[PDB]
Amino acid sequence: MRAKWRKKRTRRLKRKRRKVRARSK
């Protein structure tokens, strides 16, 4: 896939792990 959408893919992904991890802070 186009680099930039992949960069967008993983931005999304980090915000998700960033979320799930806060459930346990």
Footprint of RNA (CB under 7 A): 6, 10-15, 17-18, 21
Q: Give dist(CA 13, CA 25) in Å, integer.
A: 19
Shortest reach from residue 16's CB to RNA, in Å? 9
Tokens coding 12: 């999304």
Shortest reach from residue 8's CB to RNA, in Å? 9
Shortest reach from residue 13's CB to RNA, in Å? 7
Q: How many Cα atoms within 13 Å fall on the side-chain side of residue 22? A: 6
Nearer to RNA, 21 or 23 (CB): 21
Give the largest CA-CA distance in the chain.
35
